[PDB]
Amino acid sequence: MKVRVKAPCTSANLGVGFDVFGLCLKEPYDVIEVEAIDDKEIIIEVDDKNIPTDPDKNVAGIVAKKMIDDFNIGKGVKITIKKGVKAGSGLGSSAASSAGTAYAINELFKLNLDKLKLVDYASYGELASSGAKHADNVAPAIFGGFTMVTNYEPLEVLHIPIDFKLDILIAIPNISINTKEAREILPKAVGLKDLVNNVGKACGMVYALYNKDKSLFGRYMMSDKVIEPVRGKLIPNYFKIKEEVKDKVYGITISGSGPSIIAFPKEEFIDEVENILRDYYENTIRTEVGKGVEVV
Amino acid sequence: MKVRVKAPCTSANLGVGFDVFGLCLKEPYDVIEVEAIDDKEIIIEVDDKNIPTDPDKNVAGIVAKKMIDDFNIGKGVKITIKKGVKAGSGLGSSAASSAGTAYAINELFKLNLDKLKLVDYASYGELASSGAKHADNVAPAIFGGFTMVTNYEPLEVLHIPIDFKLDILIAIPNISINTKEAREILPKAVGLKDLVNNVGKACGMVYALYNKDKSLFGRYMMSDKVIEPVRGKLIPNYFKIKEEVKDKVYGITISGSGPSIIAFPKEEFIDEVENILRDYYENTIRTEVGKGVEVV
Ligand SMILES: Nc1ncnc2c1ncn2[C@@H]1O[C@H](COP(=O)(O)OP(=O)(O)OP(O)(O)=S)[C@@H](O)[C@H]1O
Ligand SMILES: Nc1ncnc2c1ncn2[C@@H]1O[C@H](COP(=O)(O)OP(=O)(O)O)[C@@H](O)[C@H]1O
Ligand SMILES: CC[C@H](C)[C@H](N)C(=O)O
Ligand SMILES: CC[C@H](C)[C@H](N)C(=O)O
Ligand SMILES: [Mg+2]
């Protein structure tokens, strides 16, 4: 009586889509197994010592409990987690565990819940463990492709599948940003011109996806002047890296609250761009747009 | 040596699309004819003695000069303008003549310019008449359907054709709002939460158009908390009407800077909503999405 699932990392914000946009990655990913156990308790194991095992501290245990409670399920569960990336790297590591667990509980106990609801449950994990019920990383983890969190009370997620090829390159610095360090730096106010610029460019990115225009998508993605300039200073060599890959990528920006960098390399320069990245950051991986949590 | 064309009214902003979104109307429309005259003169003849016939003032003249100049047509022109609707109402009356003028000059004088180019030149008209080059009313007038001005110098416009029926009701209050003051009382900065709400809701509207979802389009359109709550105070009964037609329209918002109001009535209530709008204001127009300037 168990299910095993692959829950992917995700890149949020994408420049002008701050707190709205999310892109699902194929890799890295967590591998999560959930087993129904008679002992009405929640047991968790993780292969990353720096991550809690306390069912009330580990995001997977927080999600599992809320769902077992809401559905008055009898069994308890043993969750075994094999982490894809460290926390604080801006690749939605916590979201992968939250979305993966919601999806796994739904499969294991045949709850037949729609994706939006799995995103909502997963969001609780992000809350209890970050004070904010943010869903811009768990929405793409569940839906796959590109998502937009367009409302919170009640949650609304709009999904745009990506059926064309989009090569992704992710550089992962050896530093960490806890998503609390993440928001303090955030400006409290924005100028009207910036609001107008980000709305226009974010809308242009949506148009670009429907018209499968990667140059347009990438160019507008790099137009944010409200947050990116601030956060970029927290990443060693980030502006130098952008400059150096300038004409070989459709676009490059910070993934989530950072420090990881996400680039969309032009087809003819993918190796060159991957080496430039790896030259500053050894932990560089090549991937593409993913499909969301799936049974394995 | 002359051409006849209709230059339609347009509605900019559409709530969260402030300074970016533009929707072309079918009616009202200016009716313009232009004759090529040897005498190097700009003969502007416009009804409604309230529009400056002075080729220096009238936007149709400016677009003529700044244009004729370039292409060195080495002539002058007889511009007959039948106004479609009043100015200062928030329906792009200026844009109608500016863009209408440009599209004719093109067709008539051999020229093979681009729609973007026509939007480009037409902008100089709005420059001297309002202040800035404003392209959000001129773009839909020329492209038809729905447009997004995503950048200035270089001017960038993204067009999304509306291929489904979208009924529109326009109400014109017999008051005048000082377009310019309707600017200075606008906030100069906004909270992060509003940048987030507006980006998400505006992106959701583009998604709604591609999914031909009028209800999602109209609901998100009414979600602006930055500009509309302030501007709407100046439009008598606006908030009361919005609440009263609430379940009978996909959405209703201010057209441009006002005082005109644009509503997207549900098929089942179009007459009833048009009547409610007539009982509060006197002038209402039932129309649909237009396809832009075209040979009469
Ligand atoms: N061909 C023309 N049609 C209409 N108004 C004109 C024209 N040429 C010049 N104008 C002048 O330009 C002004 C009208 O532009 P606005 O006050 O901005 O109104 P509007 O264009 O209807 O509304 P907006 O800006 O799109 S909300 C008036 O002061 C007019 O006298
Ligand atoms: N299963 C889990 N996987 C990853 N991080 C987890 C998990 N359970 C709890 N966490 C905790 O939540 C935080 C991670 O959130 P944050 O710093 O924003 O990074 P992330 O982007 O990976 O969510 C850490 O304090 C971490 O130990
Ligand atoms: C977890 C927080 C998320 C990534 C948010 N969009 C931010 O950048 O802070
Ligand atoms: C027609 C709309 C104009 C250009 C501007 N968005 C305003 O509301 O003042
Ligand atoms: Mg105008």
Q: What is the DSSP string of A117-173?
A: HHHHHHHHHHHHTTSS---TTHHHHHH-SEEEEEETTTTEEEEE---S--EEEEE--
Q: Which of B148, B160, B189 sits opposite A192 (nearest CB)?
A: B189
Segments forming the whole domain that contains residue B68: 1-161
Torsions phi, psi for A217 (to 5 deg): -55, -55
A179 with A113, same domain: the answer is: no
Residue-wise burial string across B139-158, b where 16 or more C-beta atoms lie within 10 A, e elsewhere? bbbbbbbbbbbbbeeebbbb
HSE (side-chain half, CA atoms, 13 Å) at A191: 6
Which of A115, A142, A161 is where one domain is finished?
A161
B293 with B267, same domain: the answer is: yes
The Cα A54–Cα A62 span in angstroms is 9
The Cα B259–Cα B175 span in angstroms is 7
B115 with B247, same domain: the answer is: no
Nearest CA to B36 among B113, B110, B100? B110
Torsions phi, psi for A162 (to 5 deg): -105, 100
Which of A145, A161, A177 is where one domain is finished?
A161
B148 with B237, same domain: the answer is: no
Residues contacting A275, CB < 8 A, separation 6+? none
Q: Measure Cα distances from B52 to A73, B61, B67 in Å.
A: 76, 10, 19
Residue-wise burial string across A21-48, b where 16 or more C-beta atoms lie within 10 A, e elsewhere? bbbbbbbbbbbbbbbbeeeeebebebee
The Cα B118–Cα B255 span in angstroms is 23
Contact B103, B293 (CB under 8 A): yes
Q: Name the pairing type of β-strands A21-37 and A146-151.
A: antiparallel
Interface of A with B in 61-80 (CB under 8 A): none
B14 with B154, same domain: the answer is: yes
Q: Is the peptide bond before A154 cis (omega within 30 degrees of 0)?
A: yes
- Cβ neighbours around B31 below 10 Å, total: 18
Q: What is the DSSP string of A56-96?
A: TTSHHHHHHHHHHHHTT---EEEEEEE-SS-TTSSS-HHHH
Q: Is the peptide bond before B236 cis (omega within 30 degrees of 0)?
A: no
The Cα A282–Cα B96 span in angstroms is 57
Q: Which of B156, B199, B219 to mutate to test the interface with A (most CBs of A within 10 A)?
A: B199
Closest atom of ligand 4 to CA, residue B231: 8
Q: Which two tokens stand for residue A95?
A: 């979201």
A12 with A155, same domain: the answer is: yes
Number of domains in chain A: 2
Tell me the nearest-neighbour CA distance from B157 into chain A, angstroms.
9
B147 with B170, same domain: the answer is: no
Measured between CB atoms, does B220 come within 8 Å of chain A? Answer: yes
Residues counted in chain A: 296
- A149: which chain B residues are within 8 Å (Cβ-Cβ)? 200
Which of B132, B161, B190 is where one domain is finished?
B161
3-class secondary structure, A21: strand
A114 with A51, same domain: the answer is: yes
Q: Is the peptide bond before A55 cis (omega within 30 degrees of 0)?
A: no
- Cβ neighbours around A102 below 10 Å, total: 32
Q: Which two tokens stand for residue A36?
A: 């129904």
Q: Which two tokens stand for residue B173?
A: 């209050």
A5 with A141, same domain: the answer is: yes
CATH number for the domain spanning A95: value is 3.30.230.10
Please measure the distance between the N-terminal and C-terminal CA atoms of chain B and give it in whole angstroms.
Answer: 15
Q: Which two tokens stand for residue A230?
A: 């601030």
- A20: which chain B residues are within 8 Å (Cβ-Cβ)? 196, 199-200, 203
The Cα A260–Cα A170 span in angstroms is 7
- Which residue type does B160 have? I
A168 with A21, same domain: the answer is: no
Tell me the nearest-neighbour CA distance from B195 into chain A, angstroms.
6
CATH number for the domain spanning B269: value is 3.30.70.890
3-class secondary structure, A99: helix
The Cα A44–Cα A33 span in angstroms is 10
Residue A236 per-residue DSSP state: T
What residue owns the CA closest to ligand 4's atom 8? B257
A135 with A245, same domain: the answer is: no
Contact A45, A87 (CB under 8 A): no
Measured in angstroms, the resolution is: 1.9
* CA of A210 relative to ligand 5 center, distance in Å: 30
Which experiment gave this structure?
Answer: X-ray
**HEC-encoded secondary structure of chain B:** CEEEEEEEEEEECCHHHCCCEEEEEEEEEEEEEEEEECCCCEEEEECCCCCCCCCCCCHHHHHHHHHHHHCCCCCEEEEEEECCCCCCCCCCHHHHHHHHHHHHHHHHCCCCCCHHHHHHHHHHHHHHHHCCCCCCCHHHHHHCCEEEEEECCCCEEEEECCCCCCEEEEEECCCCCCCCHHHHCCCCEEEHHHHHHHHHHHHHHHHHHHCCCHHHHHHHHCCCCCCHHHHHHHCCCHHHHHHHCCCCEEEEEECCCCCCEEEEECHHHHHHHHHHHHHHCCEEEEEEECCCCEEC
B119 with B260, same domain: the answer is: no
Q: What residue ranges line ligand 3, CB within 6 angstroms?
A: A 12-13, 18-19, 134, 136-137, 179, 182-183, 256-257
Q: Which two tokens stand for residue A208?
A: 């670009």
The Cα A148–Cα A136 span in angstroms is 7
Rg of chain A over Cα atoms, rounded to whole angstroms, equals 19
Q: Which of B20, B149, B204 sits opposite A158 (nearest CB)?
A: B204
- B203: which chain A residues are within 8 Å (Cβ-Cβ)? 17, 20-21, 148, 150, 158, 202-203, 205-206
Contact A20, A136 (CB under 8 A): yes
Phi-psi region of A44 (alpha: psi -120 to 50; beta: other; left: phi over 0): beta
Q: Is the peptide bond before A229 cis (omega within 30 degrees of 0)?
A: no
H or E segment and range at residue A12 = strand A2-12
- Which residue type does B151 have? N
Q: Name the pairing type of β-strands A261-265 and A167-171.
A: antiparallel
Contact B280, B134 (CB under 8 A): no
Residues contacting B128, CB < 8 A, separation 6+? B57, B59, B62
The Cα A228–Cα A238 span in angstroms is 11
Residues contacting A152, CB < 8 A, separation 6+? A133, A135
The Cα A286–Cα A183 span in angstroms is 28
**Residue B179 annotated among the catalytic residues of the structure:** yes
